Design a protein around this nucleic acid. Structure first.
Ligand SMILES: C[C@@H]1C[C@H]2[C@@H]3C[C@H](F)C4=CC(=O)C=C[C@]4(C)[C@@]3(F)[C@@H](O)C[C@]2(C)[C@@]1(OC(=O)c1ccco1)C(=O)SCF
Ligand SMILES: C[C@@H]1C[C@H]2[C@@H]3C[C@H](F)C4=CC(=O)C=C[C@]4(C)[C@@]3(F)[C@@H](O)C[C@]2(C)[C@@]1(OC(=O)c1ccco1)C(=O)SCF
Ligand SMILES: [Zn+2]
Ligand SMILES: [Zn+2]
Ligand SMILES: [Zn+2]
Ligand SMILES: [Zn+2]
Lengths: 321, 12, 321
DNA sequence: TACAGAACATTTTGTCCGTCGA
DNA sequence: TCGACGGACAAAATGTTCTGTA
């Protein structure tokens, strides 16, 4: 992969004594033939890379000379997760009336409660989860609810735009400008981590479906589950299923391998993202001064959960360490 | 003694 | 008499988008806004936007558009910080040879040692620093050295590319494929937070130089310094100086306070970045079986620092509480 | 009278592909 | 044969004029 000694773009040959790409060859020929008394808007040391080579013609021409230039239906397990995926819910927000810190937080609580209605139904339809004991089912959803909603939020934001957004609902998107104000700043930094990594990794839909499942199976009781033997076969099967999705992408064994490493590191870092989103949810729930309203669906989970984090009764599962 | 940082600090 | 464009200083056509701009800057702005452009600067976010050099940096021209207010000799303290800013060092890396995890870390530790020899010289050049007591001067450098070097690494990595890469030196840059292998995935995630935050914030050269100075004055002993009253005055001089940089950058944006909130929020997050980086550093230093080499300069600091962070003999100074 | 987006236009950069020399 | 010139073409980035509407 010969690199252009001027802009690092894939070189096309040894042009004018220097290994350069097509563009730098013709730029150089033009910069000497034309009188071109090029000016630098900076400090005569602008970085010349493929994207910014258009930027400073004075530094690019300077760099050219410095280099040396001169003259069968059979349903798949993954396709079931795709079919069971719930449809995106609307926040019921009204952009018409002014924006408010109370209105936003409360609307998102109501949307999260409705989203928890589908989170339970979606879990029931997971091949293997319906086999688990009712209290293992009800507890796995309790331990990893914030994980599912934040990952799906990260996914919705990743799919919504390349911009730093938070896409809670199709009718409620908090642009970068709004989430940098102090009222949203610290909490949004954690909500944005997910979409930041989904973009970085270019996570596919089939990779996301397996990852979102592995998140439902990511937090168990510190004294283990009732249907624990069964749980370990379901979890192991979805780990294998994630690898199947990674294969459908590139096909190079080492590429596929590092992709698995990075995606499992992501599933792992989710415990830290949940850890910080729970901290602000518990602070706004227990604070009478706040007035932010939580729906009966979400409030029920929060009341059960706060004494579980205070008593260390959780065994966070990690692919690494 | 002293540390290379102390030696480098007072060295005008 | 010729009315001038408040963006490029070319004969203005009228009051376009609130500002008295010329026909070209007017259409450039409308294109850059609705074209949802991601412009990366080849310089240091402060290129001169004048009639000849308006074609050069579109990232800066779109900033001088927003600092004008578009919508749909006497040396200053910061000019001195620019002048005392250290020259970029080379790792002396043999890039045409097979790489190792030990080799890279040893090389980097040796480079960090040379950087300390430069950062001590840079520190003495900061007006007021040589005015503190020697036990305070040493303590400031001992506490904030990783903070200094990682913040400067973020700037070098920000400048070097829009891609996720750590530009330690021109001859030692670690690409995303290499930073995500298990041997160095977690350490690189913290060093990469700085360059991605400087990237997100479009931090200008002036704001950067002031924040870097404030990183030197970000940590103090648990029982205070010897010349604490002078230290507080110097620290507050550079906070006033960072605010002057924000006024220069934003101009007529109205978001000077919001800008300061974000930059000071980043200055605070540097403690967390450094705490993570230090934990790998100390752990590696003490691990005899790793046998990685550390320079005499740094090994003296590390050894005279490990029983201070554990003994809570540090008071991390935060803007936000 | 003016300013905004469209219409037209110019300038700056980058690609293709012969021809030709070692 | 191979690989690099350079013109021809093309694409991208920038600039100017025209026209609709207060
Ligand atoms: C920090 C908490 C966590 C927030 C929830 C995160 C969850 F991932 C989620 C995803 C959605 O698609 C829709 C809603 C939720 C379930 C959630 F965003 C909301 O209820 C709000 C929660 C609890 C949270 O978020 C914020 O700080 C926040 C969001 C926007 C600005 O601040 C709150 O504690 S809101 C206080 F009740
Ligand atoms: C994670 C630690 C922190 C590393 C230092 C960070 C600092 F910002 C820095 C910048 C430079 O330009 C050159 C060197 C240092 C001073 C530093 F990179 C090195 O010493 C190595 C440090 C301590 C560190 O780095 C890594 O793991 C690492 C970086 C890239 C791959 O691995 C180590 O602990 S290496 C052993 F100390
Ligand atoms: Zn090039
Ligand atoms: Zn330049
Ligand atoms: Zn102009
Ligand atoms: Zn610029």
């Amino acid at each position: 992969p010969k690199l252009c000694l001027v802009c690092s773009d894939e070189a096309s040959g040894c042009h004018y004594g220097v290994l350069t790409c097509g563009s730098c060859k013709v730029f150089f020929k033009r910069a000497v033939e034309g009188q071109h008394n090029y000016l630098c808007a900076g400090r005569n040391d602008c970085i010349i890379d493929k994207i910014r080579r258009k930027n400073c013609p004075a530094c690019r021409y300077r760099k050219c000379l410095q280099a040396g230039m001169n003259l069968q239906l059979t349903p798949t397990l993954v396709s079931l997760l795709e079919v069971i995926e719930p449809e995106v819910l609307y926040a019921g927000y009204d952009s018409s009336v002014p924006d408010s810190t109370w209105r936003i937080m409360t609307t998102l609580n109501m949307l999260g409660g409705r989203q928890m209605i589908a989170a339970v139904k979606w879990a029931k339809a997971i091949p293997g989860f319906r086999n688990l004991h009712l209290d293992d089912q009800m507890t796995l959803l309790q331990y990893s609810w914030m994980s599912l909603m934040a990952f799906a939020l990260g996914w919705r934001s990743y799919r919504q735009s390349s911009a730093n957004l938070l896409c809670f609902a199709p009718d409620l998107i908090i642009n970068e400008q709004r989430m940098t104000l102090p009222d949203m700043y610290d909490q949004c930094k954690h909500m944005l981590y997910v979409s930041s990594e989904l973009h970085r990794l270019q996570v596919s839909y089939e990779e996301y479906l397996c990852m979102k499942t592995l998140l439902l199976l990511s937090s168990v009781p510190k004294d283990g589950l009732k249907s624990q033997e069964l749980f370990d076969e379901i979890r192991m099967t979805y780990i294998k299923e994630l690898g199947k999705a990674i294969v459908k992408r590139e096909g190079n064994s080492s590429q596929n391998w590092q992709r698995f490493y990075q995606l499992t590191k992501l599933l792992d870092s989710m415990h830290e993202v949940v850890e910080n989103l729970l901290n602000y949810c518990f602070q706004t729930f227990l604070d009478k001064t706040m007035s932010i309203e939580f729906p009966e669906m979400l409030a029920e989970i929060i009341t059960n959960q706060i004494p579980k984090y205070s008593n260390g009764n959780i065994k966070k599962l990690l692919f690494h360490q | 003694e002293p540390s290379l940082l102390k030696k480098l600090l007072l060295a005008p």
